[PDB]
């Protein structure tokens, strides 16, 4: 492939460099339209800019935490982190979010990796070996109330059991209701005067519940869960302007008030180098 062809002096009536940008086109002008060039080859394919590659590496999408401790006398397991739960989403953390929102609709399979590490902040004789159980609780299915409810039987709901310190990995097909996931949605769930605006109403994916299977030892053990997400088989439509201001909320476009100028001011003139 040639990156530049050889081109010499020109004295024409045919001027490729004068255009009318009002038309909305970006005319494909090249170095050889306005200087004299020599042949050179590309030596490159643009492999690593493919959208599959761009969205295809694992990104941390969520960090939660649960603890193993005596539940005796706990009136609210959920509240004691005896078993936390997460509202599956892909915008709570922003590195990956800005990347996805370069597109309007996106379609892909997900590969999740879940790393779990334990901490024992206060005096323990040892490090126990805990097994985590993460359940998929899609919307419409009983959601766990205690850390050892009938729910955890999970007879119809996919669940994975792995050890703290290890990693769990599995992959979920594209579960969207439509043909693509909306990265943006300028609508409502119905014509209500006070219903919420945005996509919050659209990515009704449900939540995922984590717990330790082990009963309690004499000390307490903090287990912190990190969920990583990798898109595989990516398809993206309609590019948009990149995110400039900071994010404030999952699912709304809102930016913070009295934010700071995002364009760097010159130290000098327009004329400055």
């Amino acid at each position: 492939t040639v990156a530049s062809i050889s081109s010499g002096p020109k004295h024409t009536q045919k001027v490729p460099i004068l255009t009318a940008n009002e038309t909305g086109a970006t005319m494909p002008v090249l170095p050889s339209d306005s200087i004299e060039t020599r042949t050179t080859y590309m030596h490159f394919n643009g492999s690593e800019t493919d959208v599959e590659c761009f969205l295809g590496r694992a990104a941390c999408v969520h960090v939660t935490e649960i603890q193993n401790k005596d539940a005796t006398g706990i009136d609210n397991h959920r509240e004691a982190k005896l078993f936390n739960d997460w509202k599956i989403s892909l915008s709570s953390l922003v590195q990956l979010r800005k990347k996805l929102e370069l597109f309007t609709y996106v379609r892909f399979d997900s590969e999740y990796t879940i790393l779990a590490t334990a901490s024992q902040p206060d005096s323990a004789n040892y490090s126990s070996n805990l097994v985590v159980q993460a359940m998929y609780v899609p919307p419409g299915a009983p959601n766990p109330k205690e850390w050892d409810d009938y729910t955890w039987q999970s007879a119809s709901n996919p669940s994975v059991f792995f050890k703290v310190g290890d990693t769990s990995r599995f992959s979920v097909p594209y579960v969207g209701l439509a043909s693509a996931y909306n990265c943006f949605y300028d609508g409502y769930s119905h014509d209500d005067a006070e219903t919420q605006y945005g996509i919050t109403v659209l990515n009704h994916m449900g939540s995922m519940a984590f717990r330790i299977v082990n009963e309690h030892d004499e000390h307490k053990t903090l287990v912190k869960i990190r969920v990583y997400h990798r898109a595989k088989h990516v398809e993206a439509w309609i590019p948009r302007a990149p995110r400039a201001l900071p994010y404030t909320s999952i699912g709304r476009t809102n930016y913070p008030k009295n934010t700071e100028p995002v364009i760097k001011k010159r130290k000098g003139d327009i004329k400055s180098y």
Binding site: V15, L18, T19, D33, A59, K98, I238, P242, K264
Partner: protein, 236 residues
Amino acid sequence: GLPTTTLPGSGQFLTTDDRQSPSALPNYEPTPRIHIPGKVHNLLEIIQVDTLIPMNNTHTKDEVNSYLIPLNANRQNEQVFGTNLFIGDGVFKTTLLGEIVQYYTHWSGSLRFSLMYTGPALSSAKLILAYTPPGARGPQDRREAMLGTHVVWDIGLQSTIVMTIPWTSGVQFRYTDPDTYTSAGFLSCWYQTSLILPPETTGQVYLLSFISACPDFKLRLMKDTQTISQTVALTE
């Protein structure tokens, strides 16, 4: 039972590896795809669309006005604007090109810089745009500027002029992030003759300026952008 040996790296999680995994939802059938206009396949497809450069960066809070390069009637010989070409920083940095370049470590290729004139139709002007390849200082006067890559632009019916910064380089890749060794030059613009307004007309006229990449362009070695960060996880 077949005998095996495990190598160094067993059990590691590399966020960039690509392997098979069990599906959690065995046998599930995804929604059919329907057709949607606009599919993107490569980021190289989109960095060829031009977008506006806030060249007039001299303000103090972001404003629509930093997209406008002003022009003065009757000045002769003088300089319209100047900038270095660190596409990952400075004026370029918020443009779509600048914004994507920042997802990669290295870039190579030609850039297309165009200026669209917005003055009254009955006015006229001749400007010179000059690209100064690495190695010399930003030009200080047109004489200096005109000895490097340049285009005399004659403002006419055809409203825009497309200047190309041809890839001039020893090393075949430059870093996006400002490197010296790897630096690309300067871009300046001066009156060639001068802007002239028709009667009954007055004041400043402005040029809009765009930047996009030529088909020439290469970007490689993906990394994280300095353009976005956060202090606590967001919630709904």
